[PDB]
Symmetry: D2
Subunit: 279 residues, 4 copies
Amino acid sequence: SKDAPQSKFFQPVLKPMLPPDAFQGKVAFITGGGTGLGKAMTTFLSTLGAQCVIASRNIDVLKATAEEISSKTGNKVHAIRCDVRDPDMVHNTVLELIKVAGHPDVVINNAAGNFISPSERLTPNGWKTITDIVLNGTAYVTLEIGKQLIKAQKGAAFLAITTIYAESGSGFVMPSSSAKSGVEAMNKSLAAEWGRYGMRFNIIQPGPIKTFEKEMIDRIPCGRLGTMEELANLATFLCSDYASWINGAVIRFDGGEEVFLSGEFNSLKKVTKEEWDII
Amino acid sequence: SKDAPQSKFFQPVLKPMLPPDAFQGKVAFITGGGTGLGKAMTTFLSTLGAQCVIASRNIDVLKATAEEISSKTGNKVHAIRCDVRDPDMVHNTVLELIKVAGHPDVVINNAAGNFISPSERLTPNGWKTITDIVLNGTAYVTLEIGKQLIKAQKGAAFLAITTIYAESGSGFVMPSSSAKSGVEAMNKSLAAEWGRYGMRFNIIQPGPIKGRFEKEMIDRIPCGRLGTMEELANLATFLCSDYASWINGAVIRFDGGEEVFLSGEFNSLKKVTKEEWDIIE
Amino acid sequence: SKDAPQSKFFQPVLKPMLPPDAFQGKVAFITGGGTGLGKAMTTFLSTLGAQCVIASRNIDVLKATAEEISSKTGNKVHAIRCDVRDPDMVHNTVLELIKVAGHPDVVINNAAGNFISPSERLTPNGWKTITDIVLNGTAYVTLEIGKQLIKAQKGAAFLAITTIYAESGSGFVMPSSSAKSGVEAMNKSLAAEWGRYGMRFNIIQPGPIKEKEMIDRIPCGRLGTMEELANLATFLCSDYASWINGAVIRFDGGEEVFLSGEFNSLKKVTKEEWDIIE
Amino acid sequence: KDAPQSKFFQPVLKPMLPPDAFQGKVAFITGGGTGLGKAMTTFLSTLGAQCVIASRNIDVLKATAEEISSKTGNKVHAIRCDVRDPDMVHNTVLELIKVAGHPDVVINNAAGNFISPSERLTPNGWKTITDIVLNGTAYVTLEIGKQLIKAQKGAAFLAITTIYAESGSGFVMPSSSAKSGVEAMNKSLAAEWGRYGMRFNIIQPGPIKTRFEKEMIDRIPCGRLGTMEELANLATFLCSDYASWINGAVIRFDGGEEVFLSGEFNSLKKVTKEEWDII
């Protein structure tokens, strides 16, 4: 493939790492749970015993993913259609979650939109679409669930999937960077504010996950792209009771990409042994 | 005043620090320029020779401030009504800026809204108001001006006023923290993306600037006092001046040491007395 | 107890979370592995199948811990005396590690010293002691093992235990903050430089691990446990984390986000006061 | 030569603060005989300060002191000091107080560095860099601080680190480590020593004028290297009474280099207009 030689030292493990009943009796709510990383996280949660609820705009995709997962694990996966931009729809969706499965013990905000563009080509509407979906949508889901958990006197573990470029900034993905950085600040804020209510909040910042990646592999110390299964192991750990004292954490899941990118002299990896020998 | 004793070591200097006419021939655009921090920055820019344009919702406040500043400095201050939440109004405001003063050399995004609230008492409308004004408003201003500068083949220095709690998060100001963190990521992105177009972007993160929180805040500020708007204006004018032409993508805490004090796990041991330390030894 | 009411929502799970053979065939090297967090990490590694080598200054403590762990798990734990301040002793310790167990797959730099003091009461010797143990000691171990792994074309996962105050700074623990921040920069540097040699490097930043004043600043309402730390550490050193490199993970019950937020002290405002403020 | 956009970011080399901004003040600068230290000393002296410069080479220090004082008319004293030696640092601080006075301004700039694969570092090479940069800055800062506490006087401290202290970087790993330690030290003392009137700030430079340098320019949004005069303007501002409420701050002085390096998609600057149109 396109992987670099050092990838032999960093082979992925794709199987769930936690014990087979680690989420028995637990309820999990995953936005964007019908596709991609959301589907992978839902799959692992369901495999480990959770009753899952997935929500996004496309009910056909959600129902297909829900049947696929539940057929494989024997545990229920419920689909609820929801555009997270619509705070009234979010409110109804949370009420439905509580009715069909119960208050959630695990909340994963993963719904996102993105497109790569020179910033000077962005329109105000394109800007507002990304910030509405990523930032406002995560806020509405988080606040609505939080209010219900406070009313019920129940706690939960929340996880938001952002990106390494939320904290650094990045050209060409500027609206996504901005909205995702807002999501990070939101979760750090609520980690500090809502401990008394039993809610903890963590962030995973992914690099590139397999799903122009030769150029990307050249900037990844581990020499390969990440996998959704590995991300799901990290996410399920953070959402599990084994991580009940992990709160306000921000975890890079990136093969070393961000430390590589950010270090001023890391490009000197291209200097050969022979060139170093020659001073 | 209510200041802590060590404030004697950190007295503020309120006069502009840069040379007279350091902004002669320059145009500056300041959102929120009619009040508070925005007015202080506009005052210093005008004093140093800039032609300024201030924009916000209240035209009477803007006109009053413009007349007040221009009558002291002798340099023109133009007022334009603009709700930064409305991208069409932002577009028209930038067109007027160029028509009445010219392309800006200095852009300061300072318009904001905020309130303190338990997050569980927030409504979607309150959430939207803060994020729309702070995050979307700054984006519309920055993108609209940037596109015009690219078309004119001119550069500029941009400055955004955020807060120390954008990077840390904070309970009780969570919408502001989120929106302001978005503004930080926006500016770091454009500093990296738009160098080829001659635009640089920097961030100031203020602590509290000059009723019970204020007293407790002083106890958490190493410099022993609140900041002043004049000091903030000195920092802002420096960063927007040609003396800072190689400062780009920078984030600068202006907080009297508040954030380092807050963030350090054992800083509360300031209360331990000399005699208690002798025992501990 | 001293725990806050909300701790009921965040009860610790003390059992090892990874599968029983997650470290079968692996060799781990743990500085400070005879006590405290190092002992807890070694215990979980050994329980999960690793062969472990623990190194620090006190050979009697190390031997007692080695016997305790290996008796319970059935897997070997080797003790080596090593003062990490001494690079020649570090070199000899790494040679012995390779002879008795083999090249390590897992390296945990945990040896440290600390004391609380006003910074104006520090002496040059006190400064040197903390920085030499924490920063230079971790550098010597990491450089010595890394050079051996490069020669052998074998990879490993490295973990350094720092602290939340490495990144923030903190008064009263200033030498420790400085040394530990140096350790963080070291590991981020090598995560980027040495991935090409199959080594990855991560950091855990702990809050307080088993006082009441501290608990009131922790959102989770209790101190952390060594078993929870060991679950996080073993995950990061396991092949399930083979794409986690250069990461810095707070393990602090929320303490650092609570401390660092300008308005977080408003947690003291009552419901009635908020009603009034509205 | 510089990149095409450099014409938009031209340097201003003249001191920006008022002519007497440091009249009556005393400044102590480690490494003040060369490079950035000499530039900072030059601006301080021009603005009225009485300066004391300290490093290992007394002949260089003497030459620089005469050169500066002959141009400004303000005294510059040379004191030989290897900052690795805490007893020599103690003696140097006592001489500073005797010949000039307690310092109002303290700039820790002495450093050593060399670029090397980390696997080519020796323990002695490691210890040399950490001793000079981290221990040397600690000894200077602590010894001066103790004297200022005894006299009930305050001061502004400034440490020159680097953008790679906070990020890490391969090939400069000991410098990254030691300089990160300096950052933590200064943030710690800003929080601890407010009651004593001492504030502490950090400048993180990118590449400053005086092979890799042409490649570096392509990674610098401002399109050129920085100048020592511009750095001296930033440093004199931070050490002046105009910045008396700036404390614990860390300021990048890097032409945008760090935000460029750190952003995941910034390399898409190479995509042409026609390629973007196609999309």
